[PDB]
Amino acid sequence: TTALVCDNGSGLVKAGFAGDDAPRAVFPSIVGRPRHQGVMVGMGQKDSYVGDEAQSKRGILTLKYPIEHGIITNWDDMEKIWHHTFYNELRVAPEEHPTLLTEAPLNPKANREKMTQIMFETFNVPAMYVAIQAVLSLYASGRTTGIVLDSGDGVTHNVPIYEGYALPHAIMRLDLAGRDLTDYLMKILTERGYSFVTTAEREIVRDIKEKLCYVALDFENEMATAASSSSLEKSYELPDGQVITIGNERFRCPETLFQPSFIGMESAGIHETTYNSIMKCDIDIRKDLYANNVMSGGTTMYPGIADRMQKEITALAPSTMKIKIIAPPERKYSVWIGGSILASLSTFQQMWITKQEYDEAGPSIVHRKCF
Amino acid sequence: TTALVCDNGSGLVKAGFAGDDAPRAVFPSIVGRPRHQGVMVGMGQKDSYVGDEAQSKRGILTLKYPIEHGIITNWDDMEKIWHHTFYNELRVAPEEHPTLLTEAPLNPKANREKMTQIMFETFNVPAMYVAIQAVLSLYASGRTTGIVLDSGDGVTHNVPIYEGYALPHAIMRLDLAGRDLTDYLMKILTERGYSFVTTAEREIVRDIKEKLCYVALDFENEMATAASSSSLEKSYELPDGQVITIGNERFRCPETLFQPSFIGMESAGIHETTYNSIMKCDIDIRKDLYANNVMSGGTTMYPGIADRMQKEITALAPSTMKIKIIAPPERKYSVWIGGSILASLSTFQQMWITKQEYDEAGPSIVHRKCF
Amino acid sequence: TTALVCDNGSGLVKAGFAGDDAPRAVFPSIVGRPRHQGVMVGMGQKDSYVGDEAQSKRGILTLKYPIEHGIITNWDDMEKIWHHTFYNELRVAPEEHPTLLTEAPLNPKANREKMTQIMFETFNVPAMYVAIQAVLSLYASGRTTGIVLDSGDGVTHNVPIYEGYALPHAIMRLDLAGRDLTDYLMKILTERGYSFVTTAEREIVRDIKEKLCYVALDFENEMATAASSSSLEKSYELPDGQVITIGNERFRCPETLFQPSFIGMESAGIHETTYNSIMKCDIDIRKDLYANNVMSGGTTMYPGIADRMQKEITALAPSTMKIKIIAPPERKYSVWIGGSILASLSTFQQMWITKQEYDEAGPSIVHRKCF
Amino acid sequence: TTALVCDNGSGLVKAGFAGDDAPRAVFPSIVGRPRHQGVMVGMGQKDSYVGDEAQSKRGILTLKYPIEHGIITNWDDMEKIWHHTFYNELRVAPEEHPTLLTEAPLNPKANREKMTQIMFETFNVPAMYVAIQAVLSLYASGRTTGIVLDSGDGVTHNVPIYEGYALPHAIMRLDLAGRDLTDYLMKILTERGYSFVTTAEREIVRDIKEKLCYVALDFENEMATAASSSSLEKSYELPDGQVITIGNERFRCPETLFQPSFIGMESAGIHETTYNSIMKCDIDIRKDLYANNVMSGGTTMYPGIADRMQKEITALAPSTMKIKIIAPPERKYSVWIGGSILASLSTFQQMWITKQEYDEAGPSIVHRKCF
Amino acid sequence: TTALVCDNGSGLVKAGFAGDDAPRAVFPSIVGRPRHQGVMVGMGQKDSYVGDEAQSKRGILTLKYPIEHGIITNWDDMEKIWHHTFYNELRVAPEEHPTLLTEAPLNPKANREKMTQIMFETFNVPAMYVAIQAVLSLYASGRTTGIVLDSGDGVTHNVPIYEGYALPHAIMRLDLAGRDLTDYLMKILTERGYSFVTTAEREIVRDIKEKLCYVALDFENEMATAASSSSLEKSYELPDGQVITIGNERFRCPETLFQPSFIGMESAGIHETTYNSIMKCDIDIRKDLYANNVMSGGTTMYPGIADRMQKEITALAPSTMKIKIIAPPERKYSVWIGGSILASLSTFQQMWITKQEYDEAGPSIVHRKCF
Amino acid sequence: APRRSVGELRLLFEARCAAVAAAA
Ligand SMILES: Nc1ncnc2c1ncn2[C@@H]1O[C@H](COP(=O)(O)OP(=O)(O)O)[C@@H](O)[C@H]1O
Ligand SMILES: Nc1ncnc2c1ncn2[C@@H]1O[C@H](COP(=O)(O)OP(=O)(O)O)[C@@H](O)[C@H]1O
Ligand SMILES: Nc1ncnc2c1ncn2[C@@H]1O[C@H](COP(=O)(O)OP(=O)(O)O)[C@@H](O)[C@H]1O
Ligand SMILES: Nc1ncnc2c1ncn2[C@@H]1O[C@H](COP(=O)(O)OP(=O)(O)O)[C@@H](O)[C@H]1O
Ligand SMILES: Nc1ncnc2c1ncn2[C@@H]1O[C@H](COP(=O)(O)OP(=O)(O)O)[C@@H](O)[C@H]1O
Ligand SMILES: [Mg+2]
Ligand SMILES: [Mg+2]
Ligand SMILES: [Mg+2]
Ligand SMILES: [Mg+2]
Ligand SMILES: [Mg+2]
């Protein structure tokens, strides 16, 4: 039976059958529960709403994300998100379809174990696998060698790979991504009095972030330009028709990827952690990593982020190195497309965790077979 | 059928058909095995890489040399190097081509026996021979009389010869060669902080040694000049574009051939062991050995080594003796060129170990026939 | 005037007067600079904090080590560490006290020169010397003959010695030590979700490493025991009272000394590099090196490390050899105690670099006199 | 005052007072000088070690023999060996004790002169004499008639004697002895890969030679037996506990005494030179030389050497001659025992070179008085 | 056809056609066989070198003389020397040329018989004769009356002759000649450490003997002069350019002709045996023998030998006798020149041993016809 | 000094071996 690929990343579920060019179910990884009284009988007023249901009811629900910093914090609601994914969105019975899950690297083994338990005992799936998201992101590009930069909703991670052979000591994970960008955008939009505090408003500032924000090529000069002229200001219309206007916040928000100290995060920026990841690699392969930086994940979609990243690494890396960034279109879906390739690759059909292996070895099997 | 010449010296295999002017396969005698995880399926990820394959993948492989100090330590990998030599590089079935092997003198009889076993029972070759590399080096120089100084990757040896008639008591072998020079170059490059420690980095310092190093004509005055001025410094560019700069290391590295005490080796230098080898010869022939010093092997390629050797032996030898050094171009390939001559010589066709003789006498035959 | 011994190793400064039994100033070689805003005036808010000052303020400072892999990377901060050592901790004016510095072997000559420049021109010290740390480690044991294995915060090195006469070709340095153990412990503590990422958290994982970790005697069976039973688990209390629990990480961390491939380091383990160092020695003295393995440096303090090292070398070394390891108590301070001996030895008072010799010969003098 | 006997042969000094049954100081005639750096102060690290001192420190010293082929090549070190002999071993002031030296025949007159100069002007000895070692070897047997075969470390010589009256034209000296046997044993132990190259290893192969080697009675049949069966193999344990195994090398080593062409020496063997020495004698006395072969010197200690020598001379000599070999126990010390007799013989007290005669006649006196 | 004269004396063959003034082939009577392992192609097909070829390859050959003390010891090699003489040097077919051989007197009849057999059955020569060398030496002088003193390489002999009529009872032969002088020169050159032991070195000491040596006129006073001053020392250059210096050895070597006891030879000297030979002659002819001492053979070429011989015989002979010595130039070739005369004398053509007489009488014929 | 091919070097040892075979 045709395999099934379900990228339970943070923020958005991407799911669909293997061999498809694009995920046929993309929806937010949100569970919403009614916030207010149940005044009006004659309706189901049902206890919980997920995905587009929760977005359609956003302003009466306490929205919550059950996966936080790439870690599933709330298995009771994540199992609802998987139920919704299979039965309501994909409209398929999982007991026929081996499911390629995926997760970020350097992630608690309790997560991979609970995902295994849930897939094999709640959904009875015939087989399962848990690929590293960055390894999947190569397949969607066709590379065998490269730095992968995945930057999601909850986590950002670098995984260097060379003809295969991911270098596990050189992997880095940052815990800085689109949620920290949303919360900092809310904090700086407070500087001119757009008080956003509810999770519905957090979900609107996520849209403001996606629609308006961009990455400055030269942050000091863009900040000076936004200070000297209104040309960089943009107006946006809230769901109630209130217009807001935004200025240097528009690029100060995604700049925090390059300057984490803006959110008080001590870590080196994403350009510096990319360079330091190449510097953890053996000196022979670094030239091909510089020649093959692959960018993936939704927070790499900002206009100019590839140009800024190339400038910053060309300033970091030795002057001869041909720094090149592979940041294609649809790089938001590249992790899913890589899973759609891998799950349909004929060599991969050896690799599944079969349910017989789970009945023999329990959750511990997925540390032995999967990378 | 045309004979086959395969100089399994250390460091580089030189192989090719007899009667050719130059070896048509020259590649490093390296077997490399993947160092890291096997993350990326959909590839052969094959268990082992040899020669230029291993160099092309250098920074993900644990490179190893299966022949060390001219002694084959690792027959399972040496048999891979021979398989690669015959089937992939020369693209020939050895069961049609009698193979002239060669080895250094004063070498364990177990090696010559295991080479015989492998050639006659793995490769089924019609016939085989194991010439001493230094004897071949006279054929490549058209000489019938001389000291030969061969200085390879793993061993250095002196063999005096007079109208034929190698003097076996005057042979000397030093166990000091290009690997000890590479490792000492690594040790002294540590003195200004270029830490090279992996075998990939050892393989880069071999390139630094080949590109930059030279032999000082007057080591004390060259050391004083490098101390007083930067004129002797040269810059080199590592595979990742990091520039390094090198100074007195440039001639301190190959100086250890003349001063083995730099690597803690107790023995007399190569000039002193050359003189002592002539001094083991009968007093009538010494004048023609002085008139016929033949230099061969890659570590004789250093600029100025012939001039330094001539100075040092002219200081050792009696003032009347016309000390002359035959250090031609292509002296790196002279052992193979000598094998190409000998294997194609009309009278040598008596000398092969036939497979009938191996079936009659086992590995012991190659001590009876070969010198 | 009584000499002064200042072991500017990595991670911890050990300093005190010569002839004392123990260093009277031991503090971390850390410089910390305020990370956050300066909100509260009416205080000095001073630009920099060092040592216990920086530990007492850890969670608001960007801690940095100015000496990295035994190499001083940050002279502007190292000169602060020396200033703090002399004026704040030891409370002494260096212009009266000749200072015995020490450094690891196979270390950039620029370091020994800059230390000389700083000591003679910033601190005006009457005289100075730079002993090799492993040579000092013999004096604290009372040996005259032995391999010394020093394993610090930044570097690990082996130095064999026989009645004197250190064998410089047999010295080995590994660049693997307590910082690589701390960072690997952080990487594996991520496997159950204790995300430590700040340098303050790195400094807490250093404490977890010191308190809980131990070296397994039989790593496969200890790993199987930790997999089969919780008996090996230990609980630790973070500075905020969050309890953590640790299991196979407890011995997987220091096991990387014996299996560097866990951190992707290619080199042979510390037992193998100890054996290979003995194997570089002349065959007569090897029996006394086996009989005199001296262990020093803080990362030799792990429980069971002497037993594991003895097992591994007894498996490597010939069956007759009486493998003995001298791993006494206070071996953490043995390098300083050896300096306290040497600096107060009456034979050593010839050996100081006097300031007159520096005025005659500049920084280059310290390569001529010191080993 | 009681005379003093100091057998400065090659390889071992044998010394002691006259009239003693055995030399009370036997130690190797070696001077060793430190090979490596002087890292560890607080010790004398003294410039030179001699005899058992040098053996006890063997693996850090460049050992040298100052007497080579029975010729003193290095008077500055030989004078150290004499100083050690008199003041440290025998613990006696030579200015009270007339010293019987001895040397091989057919030896440069510069040696006998320099020994005279050194004894009379450095050591101020009251009197001196320089007996021929083979003439001394008769006294230890009690013969007056015989052909003495002395075979030392550096030289082997035959001296026929008849009631007195050494026949000086029939003396022969071979320059082949225990050092050539040691070096050939090293060369053939290289045939199975025990690479010995340092002088410390030369000094170990001397021990292997003394412990294991023996002289084959019928070399072709012993060689065939060692080829057909391992029964002749013996195992030996190197100072580091590495076991080596030795086979046909065990008798191929001392066979070179009978077949000098193995080391490229052209001369007739020791049996042939013994026969040719008898053949230089007048035909009447040959029967008593055949009846009185006397063997002496350490290289006559090989098991079976007397049987092989008797077989070979019985094959050379006429069938009627009663070939007899006097090869007693302690024949290693027979030259010293002969000196202990001669120096204490009352007839010999006329023969001393008095210091008055040296003050009258210079070094030339010792050619006039001594034979 | 022109007769052929072939003086197979010892050491040098002199050969040439009769009637020529000088032998056109002079070369050493040496056969040399390779001493060493022939490793190269282009050797060993030729396995025995003769004459000047053996000198040109001296240092790789065991040189041997097949005629020793004027006696042919090695007919298989002497037949090679004759083959070389006829076919390679003189380039002539002996079956056309009657050959005058010659030999010393008082010589085993087996030699003269085997020479006859070889000449008539191997070389098929038409006729042959075997003149006494001393009788030939008269013809080259033109005497009919005289003492002849022939002193060769192997033998010295005196033959008195008077108008014809050699006195066979007064013939004397000494067995002391140039080989005993060479070997004694080697023995005394050992006294200052020029160790010559190989036959190549024996062949060099023959050159030293020819170049430097001379006969002292007054041996005691020449010995005292060489002891008191270096004026008699001469320097000579060995084939490898090593200079040697020689002093009283220069005349002590040929003095052994006058004092055979130096080599232990019992006999009276050559002056005494000359006088005793005259004293065996009838008293009437002694005055003409004293007036006609003829000296011949290479060892009469020493400078001053005629003066010393005249002094010694004038001291032996009665004061009135006019002692005269005919020691002309070319007296080295006088035996051959005498054969060149005799073989071309018309009276001599009766004297040949014809092949018909050999076919009738076998080897015994040469005792009947020849003297 | 100029190069010479393996053919010329072979011709050297062929000529030498012929010379010794004639001398033998
Ligand atoms: N065009 C865009 N511009 C900026 N941010 C975007 C864009 N599209 C998506 N994002 C942000 O990226 C995150 C979703 O990325 P995604 O790759 O779906 O997460 P994951 O890697 O967990 O699957 C969200 O925070 C979203 O706001
Ligand atoms: N141009 C050069 N200059 C200096 N060293 C060289 C050069 N070319 C090769 N080498 C060194 O010589 C060694 C290889 O010599 P080679 O003759 O191939 O070995 P072998 O004698 O075992 O066949 C290596 O150590 C290599 O680094
Ligand atoms: N008891 C202990 N157990 C384990 N590790 C320790 C212990 N004490 C110190 N260490 C570690 O050893 C290192 C400090 O060693 P030290 O000898 O002070 O360094 P250096 O050799 O540079 O002076 C630090 O990484 C520290 O965490
Ligand atoms: N038992 C033995 N078997 C074989 N060789 C021996 C034995 N004892 C001593 N030798 C060798 O004999 C030599 C020493 O002989 P010695 O007589 O002491 O020398 P010298 O004649 O110069 O005094 C050394 O080479 C030593 O190795
Ligand atoms: N000028 C010379 N001075 C001294 N010795 C010589 C001289 N020429 C030849 N001899 C010696 O004489 C010997 C050769 O004499 P020769 O007459 O040729 O021998 P034969 O009498 O057998 O023919 C050799 O030992 C040679 O060294
Ligand atoms: Mg994702
Ligand atoms: Mg080679
Ligand atoms: Mg330390
Ligand atoms: Mg002796
Ligand atoms: Mg003659």
Residue numbers in the entry:
A (entry chain A), B (entry chain C), C (entry chain B), D (entry chain D), E (entry chain E): 5 to 375
F (entry chain F): 17 to 40
Question: Which sentences did the original study use to describe this structure?
Answer:
Actin filaments (F-actin) are an essential component of the cell cytoskeleton involved in numerous intracellular processes, including cell movement, division, and maintenance of cell shape. F-tractin, a 43 amino acid-long peptide, is an alternative to Lifeact for the visualization of actin filaments. The peptide consists of residues 10–52 of the rat actin-binding inositol 1,4,5-trisphosphate 3-kinase A. F-tractin labels F-actin structures without causing female sterility or significant actin defects during Drosophila oogenesis and has been proven to reliably report on F-actin organization in primary neurons without notable effects on cell function. The C-terminal helix interacts with a hydrophobic pocket formed by two neighboring actin subunits, an interaction region shared by many actin-binding polypeptides, including the popular actin-binding probe Lifeact.
By mixing F-actin with the peptide immediately prior to application to the grid, we observed a sufficient number of individual actin filaments for single-particle cryo-EM analysis. Indeed, after removing 49% of the particles, we obtained a 3.2 Å reconstruction that allowed us to build the atomic model of the F-tractin-F-actin complex. The 3.2 Å structure reveals that F-tractin is composed of a flexible N-terminal region and an amphipathic C-terminal helix. The RMSD value of 0.4 Å between the central actin subunit of the previously published structure of ADP F-actin and the central subunit of F-actin in complex with F-tractin indicated that F-tractin did not alter the structure of F-actin. We were able to unambiguously build amino acids 17–40 of F-tractin. The 16 N-terminal residues, which include six prolines and glycines, could not be resolved due to their flexibility. Following the flexible region, the next five residues (APRRS) form a structured loop, with Arg-19 forming a salt bridge with Asp-25 and Glu-334 of actin. The peptide continues as an extended α-helix that spans two adjacent actin subunits along the same filament strand. The interaction interface between the helix and F-actin is primarily hydrophobic: Val-22, Leu-25, and Phe-29 of F-tractin fit into a hydrophobic pocket formed by Tyr-143, Ile-341, Ile-345, and Leu-349 of one actin subunit, and Met-44 and Val-45 of a neighboring subunit. Additionally, Arg-32 forms hydrogen bonds with Thr-148 of actin, further stabilizing the complex.
